[PDB]
């Protein structure tokens, strides 16, 4: 792709220090600030039920792939102007590779 | 995305008139000229086992999504220079939407 696997272990701790505050990844995990992410790869944005997404997310209608996911994490608001996800971004491709590697595995 | 659903019925007959000559879509379907396509969405290119892909396909390492799939079908060789898939292309977005709609459903 334009994405290369990293460390799922490293990615797990990135998740805990940078995403856990607002999300869960487990099947049967609840929505918190942000939606539960189980089964996000291959799904379009704004389709988790029981979650109130912004108009922005839903209309962007991104199809979530490891590659899309990478550009999004770099700068969320640049990618989805108007999204209420208050996360600065993950600048280093190495960090992003690790995180996505972790996500691809735990959200399945 | 940049893809919108069509007619899976229309897409099924497009498949039969334009792709069947070289591919199968069913789980447990055999490779023919081209590889069996069961479970192609979310998979990267050149990963079907027992199939001899060109160097081109494998190194392109496309992650197959309905959107990627669309650009590919427009013009395969323009998209994967050196691919041995001898298919001209599907010029109309309407045709492509229908086909991909069919594929998303039958390759799952
Ligand atoms: C709270 C401060 C958040 C943190 C930290 C992270 N995310 Fe988030 N995310 C949050 C919200 C409120 C939302 C919904 C946005 C809206 O505008 O409706 C999101 C959304 C996502 C998405 C899109 C999901 C979809 O179903 O379309 C993804 C893929 C996502 N968030 C992932 C994610 C990751 C991996 C994070 C750590 C780097 C992360 N987010 C941080 C809130 C918050
Ligand atoms: C024989 C004349 C073909 C027709 C008609 C179609 N395809 Fe094909 N396809 C063919 C070959 C020999 C190969 C392998 C290419 C290589 O260079 O190794 C392919 C490949 C694909 C792929 C990539 C699959 C992967 O696993 O990476 C896809 C997604 C694909 N073909 C789909 C497809 C569709 C939907 C067609 C009808 C419009 C179609 N192909 C026509 C041979 C032939």
Q: Which of B1, B44, B62 sits opposite A63 (nearest CB)?
A: B1
Indicate whether residue B48 lines ligand 2 (CB < 6 A): yes
Query: Per the structure block, which two tokens stand in for B64?
Result: 């197959």
Distance of CA A46 to the CA centre of its chain: 12
Q: What is the DSSP letter of A41?
A: T
Can you tell me the distance from the alpha carbon of B3 to that of A96, in angstroms, rounded to the nearest whole number?
A: 26
Q: Is A21 in the pocket of ligand 1 (CB under 6 A)?
A: yes
CB pairs under 8 A between A and B: 24
Question: Which residues does residue A44 pair with via DSSP β-bridges, in sequence order?
Answer: A63
This PDB structure is determined at a resolution in Å of 1.8
Topology given in CATH for the domain delimited by A1-108: Cytochrome Bc1 Complex; Chain D, domain 2 (1.10.760)
Long-range contacts of residues A45-49, Cβ cutoff 8 Å, at least 24 apart: A45/A80
HEC assignment per residue over B41-77: CCCECCCCCCCCCCHHHHHHCCECCHHHHHHHHHCHH
Token pair belonging to A88? 């600065």
Residues A60-65: contacts with CB under 8 Å, at least 24 apart = A61/B1, A62/B1, A63/B1, A63/B3, A63/B65, A63/B66, A63/B67, A64/A40, A65/A1, A65/A41, A65/B42, A65/B63, A65/B65, A65/B68
Q: How many residues does chain A have?
A: 108
Nearest CA-CA partner of A99 in A6, A2, A32 = A6
Helix axes A93-106, A8-18, angle to 10 degrees: 100
With beta carbons less than 8 A apart as the criterion, state whether A76 and A87 touch.
Answer: yes
Q: Which residues of A touch B42 (CB under 8 A)?
A: 41-42, 65
Is A38 annotated as a binding-site member? no
The CA radius of gyration of chain B, in Å to the nearest whole number, is 13
Q: Given an 8 Å threshold on Cβ–Cβ distance, is A3 in contact with B63?
A: yes
* Listed residue (B30, B14, B26) closest to B96, CA to CA: B14
């Amino acid at each position: 792709t334009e994405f290369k696997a990293g460390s799922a272990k490293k990615g797990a701790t990135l998740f805990k220090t940078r995403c856990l505050q607002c999300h869960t990844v487990e099947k049967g995990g609840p929505h918190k600030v942000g939606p539960n992410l189980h089964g996000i790869f291959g799904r379009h944005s704004g389709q988790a039920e029981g979650y109130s997404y912004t108009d922005a997310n839903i209309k962007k209608n991104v199809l979530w792939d490891e590659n899309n996911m990478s550009e999004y994490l770099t700068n969320p608001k640049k990618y989805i102007p108007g999204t209420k996800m208050a996360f600065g971004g993950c600048k280093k491709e190495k960090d992003r590779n690790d995180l996505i590697t972790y996500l691809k595995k735990a959200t399945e």
